[PDB]
């Protein structure tokens with residue numbers, strides 16, 4: 001299809017960035033529809049490595065236009081930081097980045113609150129990235145946040161600015177008894193760049209509508225994973241955005257009947273960063289491997305990630321909320337050399353019931369345990385293999401199993417970090 | 432199609448309730464995906480009148496199952512209130528209402544904050560309905576709200592309850608210097624009904640998924656209108672939810688590729704309740720008519736509604752975000768007896784530019800003016816007319832004009848409040 005969507009089918013870090021860059025060979029626009037600079041994506045091309053956080057994975061192709069939709073919570077500081085360090089690598093970011101004047105702004109106070117809150121909860125911290133994404137979003141729904149559009153008028157703006165920090169300060173000090181953020185500084189830094197931001201501004205909803213009257217290729221790029229959806233995720237250990245497929249229409253402005261193909265990224269094993277429910281979590285040696293070998297460390301916080309076995313019940317969930325058309329299996333290579341592999345196929349509830357449908361909220365996952373299925377692994381290696389043919393029988397056997405259990409095809413197999421080290425059995429666009 | 436969606440294409444009150452009830456003759460489930468008991472719907476059947484607010488318009492047919500999705504912000508008080516007064520009219524609400532354990536709860540403190548905030552803003556009040564929808568939503572995105580699922584465990588719950596009111600109280604008193612809500616009371620009332628609420632609980636995302644493997648008919652029922660979308664609406668004068676078509680997938684759990692037909696309700700003239708931008712607003716006599724004749728008064732607040740001419744530029748917007756498959760024109764009859772009608776066809780900007788695309792934020796609509804087009808009306812009357820044939824040439828002429836200007840068909844024409852007083856040129860289901 002024409003409107004393709006890429007998103008994490010799990011707890012994020014399945015491999016989205018990679019895929020979005022490999023697929024943009026043939027697309028015209030790439031749209032980020034939610035999240036902030038909490039997303040941590042890693043693209044590798046001939047060894048050269050790039051980790052974007054707020055800027056879309058399409059920034060390096062000069063045929064694609066990267067748009068930052070209204071779903072995203074834009075931090076003026078982060079953009080600048082990112083933009084500059086890329087322009088220094090020969091990438092003309094400004095010649096190709098556009099954004100929504102409706103994006104809410106993340107400013108220091110958000111960070112202050114985000115971090116102050118985490119402390120308030122102590123024994124129950126969510127383990128957020130500390131980027132102030134939560135508060136940035138709250139203010140949005142509380143109808144008091146500042147958007148990209150309000151940087152235009154600067155007199156009008158400082159009044160507003162003065163109004164929200166006042167209230168935020170009041171709580172920062174009196175309530176958490178933390179330090180206050182100075183209005184004068186926040187005001188300056190923002191003002192320092194208002195014009196740069198304001199020049200990238202575009203009417204996204206409408207352009208995307210244009211793109212379509214033409215059948216232009218548009219790739220939607222997800223942030224975080226499915227079990228982090230604020231509504232459908234393991235609340236309260238989630239992100240503040242609808243990371244699931246509906247986030248696209250709300251976050252970009254494109255009508256829902258225009259989503260043509262939704263591809264879900266699947267990591268082959270499981271990771272979770274931050275706190276929260278995780279049934280198939282590996283605390284033993286096998287954990288250490290998957291983590292060692294799969295170089296599992298946060299892409300934004302450098303925090304080590306929890307690893308565990310692939311959970312087929314959670315994934316059956318994401319197929320469902322997401323109306324996935326197809327999967328893209330990543331990191332199979334990270335499994336070479338194990339004696340055998342295992343996958344969660346059903347859940348044993350705290351009262352004895354064997355279920356195949358996930359709970360849906362932190363506390364309700366509390367006592368559940370995984371009923372795995374055991375498979376012979378492979379000592380042969382698969383890293384860098386570019387064709388179904390080079391993959392050993394135990395692998396293909398593992399691959400078709402997943403399809404069986406989910407009923408969803410495996411269109412792309414990923415065997416390493418470099419763009420080129422992939423295997424496309426079916427391209428989402430011409431499907 | 433099988434999954435039909437009904438939503439307001441304007442600022443709400445276009446007529447959704449009616450239509451949802453008329454259409455549910457042939458559907459199995461009806462899902463509410465956002466909003467609260469701020470929505471005010473009015474269904475009339477053989478004169479008998481019913482105004483639902485939180486409970487779906489499908490409550491009166493005994494072949495439909497009404498589901499309250501996770502998008503909705505459920506007030507235990509409102510449900511009870513509503514449920515009881517309907518059961519008294521012979522409708523077995525409990526035999527047919529189901530809901531999501533993921534719905535966040537609206538409790539007195541929300542109302543307190545909502546109303547305290549409105550006061551804080553004074554000269555700039557949003558004119559919300561005072562139902563505490565905003566705060567109920569904030570807490571949700573702030574990851575501290577209480578959901579239907581947490582009423583299950585009652586020990587666990589009171590801790591949590593104790594935790595959020597503490598903080599909310601702190602601001603209520605210290606900050607706004609308003610009165611504090613008593614934890615003991617809130618706790619009791621909720622506890623009074625936890626079991627009733629908890630018995631209606633269902634796994635919505637999954638059932639809807641079942642409904643579909645079968646091709647069951649499912650009607651999605653919108654709340655508020657399109658220019659109230661928190662992202663895409665005239666911020667900050669909007670509701671806190673994505674009232675636009677993406678609200679469906681995020682609010683119910685159904686995958687976006689399953690939306691088959693999106694029908695938009697169109698009122699024939701314009702109303703807005705609450706404060707905010709409104710270009711074609713009629714302050715003159717013609718305003719009084721449309722308001723008098725069209726019995727324009729809030730369905731939830733009894734507040735008089737602003738009326739003005741139909742705005743084709745705003746509507747061209749909703750076609751776009753909504754990927755509307757078709758329209759349902761309501762209240763044409765309310766136009767009988769005018770010398771001539773007019774419709775906004777383009778916007779004249781504050782700097783002289785004639786545009787046909789809406790601004791998108793309160794302040795940015797500030798100076799714009801409507802470039803209307805003028806049409807002969809009709810002295811003949813259309814109220815209660817059940818067939819295209821009975822509609823006079825000036826009407827049909829008005830009708831085809833709208834289609835021209837929007838490029839979207841007019842599938843249902845509504846000529847009055849009673850269910851039966853409609854004209855279906857194309858049923859959304861078998862389309």
Ligand SMILES: Nc1nc2c(ncn2[C@@H]2O[C@H](COP(=O)(O)OP(=O)(O)O)[C@@H](O)[C@H]2O)c(=O)[nH]1
Nearest residue numbers: 013015016017040041042299331414415416417
């Ligand atoms: N070994 C291996 N690493 C991969 C593969 N695909 C991607 N990666 C790399 O693994 C990491 C996935 O983490 P991350 O970039 O945070 O994913 P994101 O959440 O989608 O942005 C990055 O190193 C990728 O370049 C693969 O198939 N094999």
Ligand SMILES: Nc1nc2c(ncn2[C@@H]2O[C@H](COP(=O)(O)OP(=O)(O)O)[C@@H](O)[C@H]2O)c(=O)[nH]1
Nearest residue numbers: 444446447448471472473730762845846847848
């Ligand atoms: N005269 C007239 N009134 C109508 C028509 N369709 C609906 N109504 C009535 O007009 C009102 C629309 O307001 P409301 O119920 O708040 O709409 P909602 O926002 O969709 O729930 C209610 O009286 C309806 O029963 C129509 O075609 N003609």
Ligand SMILES: O=P(O)(O)OC[C@H]1O[C@@H](n2cnc3c(SP(=O)(O)O)[nH+]cnc32)[C@H](O)[C@@H]1O
Nearest residue numbers: 012013038039040127128129223224239273274
């Ligand atoms: O509120 P935030 O800062 O988003 O964090 C809340 C939770 O979101 C989780 N979180 C946020 N972003 C991510 C990503 S980024 P990417 O998948 O887009 O590359 N990955 C994993 N956890 C995340 C975080 O670990 C914490 O558990």
Ligand SMILES: O=P(O)(O)OC[C@H]1O[C@@H](n2cnc3c(SP(=O)(O)O)[nH+]cnc32)[C@H](O)[C@@H]1O
Nearest residue numbers: 443444469470471558559560654655670704705
């Ligand atoms: O935060 P709320 O209470 O929703 O109100 C904010 C704005 O939402 C507007 N508002 C909320 N609900 C409605 C409806 S209800 P229905 O269309 O679902 O029947 N109609 C009109 N304005 C509304 C309200 O008038 C105020 O302008």
Ligand SMILES: O=CN(O)CC(=O)O
Nearest residue numbers: 040129298299300301
């Ligand atoms: O790639 C995303 N990261 O895991 C986020 C983080 O490390 O905080």
Ligand SMILES: O=CN(O)CC(=O)O
Nearest residue numbers: 471560729730731732
């Ligand atoms: O029908 C909905 N109403 O207009 C809401 C209200 O009156 O507040």
Ligand SMILES: [Mg+2]
Nearest residue numbers: 013040041299
């Ligand atoms: Mg990542």
Ligand SMILES: [Mg+2]
Nearest residue numbers: 444471472730
């Ligand atoms: Mg109404």
